[PDB]
């Protein structure tokens, strides 16, 4: 019985945070979204073009109609791979506190254990030796709290979920599912330029979750990044904030001085792409605690689904 | 009216345009105006290329072109956070009373830097909308055999560009963003450039520093490299281009700092590049200053590599 | 003569040839000249690419390839600056008395590393012409099951990658340049082989560290991760078909170190890239130490994994 197939709201949240896929191994989450896709489009206003692909790696595009803006989100978590004698290296810039709960699977199966800091190096403490390279995973562990959502990988998943809502209603437009986000990237770059070449888009958004601050807050609404270590062309900006505002949308204006997203590869590619990050802001980031409030996972959805269509 | 100004004048006009980077538009439509009323006077009229697919960049194509030369518009300054609080906006000099400016939806903004609580803000009349940008208050001194203002880097690169195109007969002038923060235009146009015109030479004209190595007024600086480092042979062939000439240029050899050549470097496309331009003193702060003669050898340099490249 | 060199002979011409990063120009001209002597004793002679548009790469395509293998040319060293002083030239080890070659315009160069005032310098007969490279003195060594001699990385790479192309049928071997300073001609040869050859997949034949997890001739390594994190998927495929084999490897898990995989990672083209190289003790170093077993190790897994690719 696969049922998740068919999970909607907070319980295909929950699957897609569930889903181990860290950086530089999203195809397990690439396998379950593009399934979820084939068993799903037909419910979608508008059926999209399904692009994966070896020339796209692991990576997922969706076209849907005649396209103007894309939006990007990525389906690889922060995590661990483990190296030897037990031993880990980061895989993107995790938070590492002593008994964190981690989840992977290697040859002899699945595996879990917990994070130690064991002579001021990082270990997974476990009862077997771990294949070298395995990766490894926060355990998932989805909360619904208040007006909140607690679990691990809220970034991205959330910008997975987010995506994935969009298709519910997107008319004209591309949703990229992409790969390494974590960990320096590497696939929006072909992305960027393939989409540019092939359908002329260069506006995107970057459908990202980022932080709760005491200048961006809880429930206070979706955040509109006019900046972090990267700084996008104002004017483009400037006209999201100008079509937010024709709406009644919560949303905050975040100014940041660092922190990057599928956006920098956007920027830095060799296509003259637009970009703009927006997303809901999340508690404890990097952490098997994200938390994110249901209303800005609310408004979050709201704006994109304006966006896409005046953009 | 400025439409037409010159020399230092001109400078002083284009050191005065708001322009950080991720916002060089308004200095791009000055030039723009500036180039279509000036093109006429030049000695070759180049095809202006502006528009949606270079975003807010320019670039100049004069006749059969061999080698292209890139001077980024973009400025570095400060963003208005929260509370008036600020980020930089590349790697400005932060000291307790700099001047800074502006505009937001509640009209133009003064400024002073204050380092409250060891965190950067603007010390201004009110509460600055968020992500606003500001920038370097424009103070434009002629100083002995110096000038001084507020971004000479690379206001003084640009203005080096629109000299050069004065006689320029066959090349590229590119004017480029963000090249203060990170970068992201010449990637574009590395590319354009050389798929339609399979020019892969380039000249980064951009202000370096002043060093012990690199004495104001002793020259303007062939930079052999920086935190990068371009082919051995084409910066040799920029310095026997050099040596053929009388005017004065020094070579700097540094083991910091990056320009559009590295973007260019990093590119896709076979680019060979060089960083060539006039050494400052207080680089980065409102106080950039540079020695009139090595404005004069940039040019001058510039005009017969152009010309021989 | 040293264009018929073979075995270790070929490694230590390949070591002694001063060829920095943006400066590889001579290696290159070395490898055309072996290549163009002795393409007509392998098993399938390959398409020889040199060109303007290549700068000062090669790139050698096999039969119709799957995959391509990519070797960097340029090593590490030091870039003379002012009054003798030095700036690193990738990641070099700097120890007092390292000694150090190169060539300027009064001649050959031979001195010292010294470490005066906090700061690096190069202790020389007289003064050294600005930009001038410097490498670490050749001194190739055979000693016991070791090899010892700097520039291993990568001129065993290179050296493998030519005796890879003595049995190759299919595949494209590639010599690059920069790798050891922040690369930016991979970039377009992940470009141009990708949209020319529709090969997507790499080995990086490089050389990684001896360490506590990879030991000297206990097998070449593969690398299932560095500073990078290549695709899962493809390292896997590897490792599948490396077991299918009798030859040592050991699988590499490392949390640093960059190669010329991270440009093909970061390139505009869905290149998967595998680093697969020997292990060296003291690496960046004069005395970069490599175990013959696994320099065989080496050869014959890339032999085997360029065939079944
Ligand atoms: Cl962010
Ligand atoms: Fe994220
Ligand atoms: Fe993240
Ligand atoms: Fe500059
Ligand atoms: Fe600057
Ligand atoms: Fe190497
Ligand atoms: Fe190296």
């Known amino acids: ?78 995590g661990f791979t483990v190296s030897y004698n037990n031993h880990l290296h980061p895989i993107g810039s995790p ?22 800091i064991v002579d001021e190096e990082w270990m997974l403490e476990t009862d077997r030796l771990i294949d070298r390279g395995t990766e490894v995973t926060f355990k998932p562990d989805f909360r619904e709290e208040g007006d909140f959502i607690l679990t ?36 929006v770059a072909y992305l960027a330029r393939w989409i540019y070449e092939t359908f ?10 980022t932080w709760v601050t005491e200048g961006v807050e809880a429930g206070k609404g979706v955040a509109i990044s006019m900046r972090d270590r990267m700084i996008p062309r104002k004017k483009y900006v400037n006209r999201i904030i100008e079509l937010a505002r024709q709406t009644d949308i919560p949303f905050q204006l975040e100014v940041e001085g660092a922190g990057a997203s599928d956006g920098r590869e956007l920027q830095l590619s060799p296509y003259p792409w637009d970009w703009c990050f927006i997303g809901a802001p999340e508690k404890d980031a990097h952490t098997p ?23």
Not at 14 to 36: M, Q, R, T, V, W
Not at 105 to 110: A, C, E, M, R
Not at 201 to 206: A, G, H, P, R, T
Not at 292 to 305: A, F, N, P, R, T
């Open 200 to 209: 002329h888009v260069k506006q995107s958004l970057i459908c990202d979750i």
């Open 152 to 187: 691990p990988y809220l970034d991205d998943r959330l910008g997975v979920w987010t995506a994935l809502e969009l298709a519910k209603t997107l008319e004209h437009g591309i949703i990229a599912f992409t790969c390494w986000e974590e960990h320096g990237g590497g696939s």
């Open 1 to 78: 019985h696969h049922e998740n197939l068919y999970f909607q709201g907070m319980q295909l949240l929950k699957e897609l945070c569930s889903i181990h896929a860290p950086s530089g191994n999203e195809e397990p989450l690439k396998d379950f979204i593009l399934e979820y896709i084939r068993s799903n489009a037909g419910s979608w206003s508008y059926q999209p073009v399904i692009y994966a692909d070896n020339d796209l790696q692991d990576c997922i595009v969706l076209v849907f109609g005649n396209p103007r803006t894309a939006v990007f989100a990525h389906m690889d978590s922060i």
């Open 95 to 116: 938070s590492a506190k002593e008994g964190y709960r981690l989840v992977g699977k290697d040859s002899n199966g699945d595996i879990e254990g917990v994070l130690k």
């Open 289 to 311: 605690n994200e938390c994110v409030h249901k209303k800005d996972i609310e408004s979050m959805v709201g704006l994109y689904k304006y966006l896409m269509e005046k953009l």
